[PDB]
Design a protein around this nucleic acid. Sequence first.
RNA 1: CAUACUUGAAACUGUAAGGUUGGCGUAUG
Length: 313
Amino acid sequence: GGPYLQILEQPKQRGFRFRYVCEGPSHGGLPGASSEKNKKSYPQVKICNYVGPAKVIVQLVTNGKNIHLHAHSLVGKHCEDGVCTVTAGPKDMVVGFANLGILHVTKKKVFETLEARMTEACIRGYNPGLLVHSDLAYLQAEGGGDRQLTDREKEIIRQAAVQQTKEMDLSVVRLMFTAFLPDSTGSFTRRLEPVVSDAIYDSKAPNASNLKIVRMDRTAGCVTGGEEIYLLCDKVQKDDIQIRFYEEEENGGVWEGFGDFSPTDVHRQFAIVFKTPKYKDVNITKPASVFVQLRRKSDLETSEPKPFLYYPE
RNA sequence: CAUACUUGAAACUGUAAGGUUGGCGUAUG
């Protein structure tokens, strides 16, 4: 086999938030699969069986059975018009992608935004046939693979955009990397088989984390327990809800404790009055930080945790 | 603007960056 592209590190699949235009810039880069709070990594690909100048583009695509251009935009470092374009130096063939944000289009602007993207892809020759429509492959980036779209082509895009918009999942997206190698003239037009990455799920997708603790009148208490607390939450079912206190131990252990209350203490599904559970060790000499969360007994759904401080008696 | 069926805005702050607020639509009054 000749030259090919290879993903060295996949983007992390979960925990990242897609951002809308109105939210402002720089809200954080897309993490790599091995990224950590101490050792931060990012998506990274490598060009194999070839060493020299090269162009690598990154497009956002769909997570269905048939890959298509996504309506969302890649924004941030080296990004323009929803596409990331970096060069792969003449010696180092490994490319990384830090400070990458996923710009979530609005439901109302999905169709027109998608139409604009397919067009840009058709004008630049960035995988038209694979991402827009089968009979558009004839548009290959020839130092500008048809810098001027014909009338019949805009029609194809229009039909494609409409058909592809009736079923686009705005909460999932994938990265597709495409490498181009210099031709006889030196223009990066030689295309290599693009490779798509794992799927990336929006942390703020509809129904992501439904349960939610808005505020608690107390965030600390005695290890002894039995202390009353007023918790304000989002909608909950009095008979299918509980307050879980947990602490992740040193080894693979996890201490658990439950707030004490009855269905009648759930006030209008938007608040709960309960008593704190006794802590793991009532003889600690220094305060112990733990976590508190709402949990549905039904399907074990939980809300994001909140810190709680247990102190000695 | 309030219900109903539903689901998704508008922002702000400002970063070894994230967090907080939290949502389009149809219909009915």
